[PDB]
Amino acid sequence: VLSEGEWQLVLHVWAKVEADVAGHGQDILIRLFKSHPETLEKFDRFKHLKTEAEMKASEDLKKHGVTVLTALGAILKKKGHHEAELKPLAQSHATKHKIPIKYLEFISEAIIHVLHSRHPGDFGADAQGAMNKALELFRKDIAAKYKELGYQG
Numbered sequence: 001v002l003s004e005g006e007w008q009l010v011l012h013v014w015a016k017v018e019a020d021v022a023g024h025g026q027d028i029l030i031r032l033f034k035s036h037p038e039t040l041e042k043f044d045r046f047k048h049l050k051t052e053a054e055m056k057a058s059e060d061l062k063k064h065g066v067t068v069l070t071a072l073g074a075i076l077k078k079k080g081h082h083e084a085e086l087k088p089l090a091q092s093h094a095t096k097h098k099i100p101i102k103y104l105e106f107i108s109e110a111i112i113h114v115l116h117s118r119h120p121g122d123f124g125a126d127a128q129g130a131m132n133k134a135l136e137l138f139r140k141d142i143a144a145k146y147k148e149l150g151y152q153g
């Protein structure tokens with residue numbers, strides 16, 4: 001479980017992410033798609049995007065960054081008591097979208113990367129470790145739901 005101090009470091013930098021959810025969402029989805037191209041295949045709606053320039057110019061992809069970051073934000077603010085927020089997400093990413101857990105690791109590493117570039121002063125190693133611990137909790141609670149549904153993997 002994160003400490004209260006750890007949750008504080010997480011929510012403090014998240015409050016900065018919220019000053020521009022759109023730009024963050026963009027960078028994060030683009031970094032995911034460049035680093036792990038197999039991830040982009042899972043979206044019929046973004047599959048036609050071939051370059052970074054194309055991805056940067058797509059209003060829809062930017063609309064979907066907002067969506068994803070808003071969902072994650074609602075979960076972060078619960079500081080671990082995220083049962084009702086996490087249940088729908090896992091059911092859908094397992095049974096409808098077909099997203100292995102590993103990809104959830106990839107997107108985590110992208111989020112950490114982008115938070116670092118954009119918020120150095122608020123994202124030292126101590127905030128880094130705290131954010132990692134939160135995104136592990138996330139992915140740990142999701143995996144247990146996947147396992148329930150028979151999709152562990």
Ligand code: HEM
Pocket residue numbers: 039040042043044045067068069071072088089092093097099103104107
């Ligand atoms: C922080 C982690 C992530 C969050 C919070 C997140 C959030 C969401 C939300 C809120 C939706 C729309 C509601 C729904 O369909 O359940 C969604 C849709 C989707 N997600 Fe994720 N997601 C995450 C990770 C991923 C990853 C890593 C992949 C693929 C590698 C992925 C693939 C999908 C697909 C294919 C859809 C449907 C998109 C569309 O066609 O409109 N998601 N996600």
